[PDB]
Design a protein around this nucleic acid. Structure first.
Lengths: 202, 202
DNA sequence: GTCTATAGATCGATAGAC
DNA sequence: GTCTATCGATCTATAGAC
């Protein structure tokens, strides 16, 4: 409970200001306590950031790794993964997708989180190579997906909560743009297998 | 001469580590002097950052604003602006395109640089509306352009230096992808006409 | 579990010798 | 124009009272 208020206050501060510019004092004041009291619940300011980062990088990678196994066309699997990731990043209270873009993540310690983010890019890149071959356009579907980070709000209200029966329009547009840059036709009933394939991957 | 070595070392450190994590001592050690000696050539560490940022934001904004005036089709000007910007961002020794995405730019003091980049995004978005109307796809050409920042090297060697008669393959691909997400056909002789409009804007 | 107080260390920037 | 030396501010984390 008090651990949750610290992570929520840190999520807001880190996404808006970054890790280095945010101070433990600022985190404690948002909680309503004083700076030293944070260290009862967490060992270090870094550990708060790692907890938030680990709750964003790893569900994104296991979701894409689960949707690559399922039986569909490469265009269908790529369209589903792009739509699923955007729906992931549009379902959080804060724009936690920003946490990886922070300069501090470029530190040489995040080899654990670098491999998960390179594995996530490998899923995007490999499905695209299956569509258009050894073409530099294969690297575009992943950056088209992450561009939602620059579009969604960060005021504390969830842009599009998750639904079993619906998909956000931003997720559908970015998924259509991903197939478009590869010159691939859009599969029939994109949204209605993705909801089933998302239901498949638990 | 000494100002350029400080700016080059700061360009490397800021792009790779960010503004907050980089120390004036680290900048001075790359130049080969002591930390205090930096303040002979520059008033503050912030002023070093502003000089590098202003040498990237304003050539990007005046280039796009100059090519929007010229007489051509909206698809031709959008393809040209995307291709020209990518080659700009591929022509610097360091990946200075990263400097605006740093958390420190989000400060409420950078109101000059926020308005300059909102004009730059407006050029991309307005040309897209001329192509696809009031469609959320109008925001994709700019993010497709900026994705080159996540693709180019940052070791100190220029990925593709400038040429009067040629364009980098990455510049052509992102420009073809930008029109593709809008469902627009590519104009005849894209690469060979953009070279003329770049010669136009000096 | 929260507090006050402070250690310990870094950093930005200034002053003045040469 | 570069140097040594230092001030003052800010910050992470710890110690110990309660």
């Amino acid at each position: 409970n008090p651990r949750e208020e610290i992570l929520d206050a840190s999520a807001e501060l880190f996404t808006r200001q970054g890790f280095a510019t945010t101070s433990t004092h600022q985190i404690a004041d948002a909680v309503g306590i004083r700076q030293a009291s944070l260290y009862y619940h967490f060992p270090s300011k870094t550990e708060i950031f790692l907890t938030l980062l680990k709750s964003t990088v790893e569900p994104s990678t296991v979701l894409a790794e689960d949707l690559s196994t399922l039986d569909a066309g490469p265009e269908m699997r790529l369209w589903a993964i792009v739509a699923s990731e955007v729906r992931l990043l549009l379902s959080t209270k804060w724009n936690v997708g920003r946490l990886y873009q922070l300069p501090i993540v470029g530190s040489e310690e995040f080899a654990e989180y670098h491999s998960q983010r390179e594995a996530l890019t490998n899923v995007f890149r490999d499905l695209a190579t299956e569509i258009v071959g050894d073409d530099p356009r294969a690297e575009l579907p992943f950056h088209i997906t992450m561009s939602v980070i620059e579009m969604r709000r960060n005021d504390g209200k969830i842009p599009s909560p998750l639904s079993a029966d619906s998909l956000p329009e931003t997720a559908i547009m970015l998924a259509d743009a991903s197939l478009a840059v590869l010159g691939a036709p859009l599969p029939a009933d994109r949204v209605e297998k993705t909801l089933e394939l998302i239901k498949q991957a638990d």
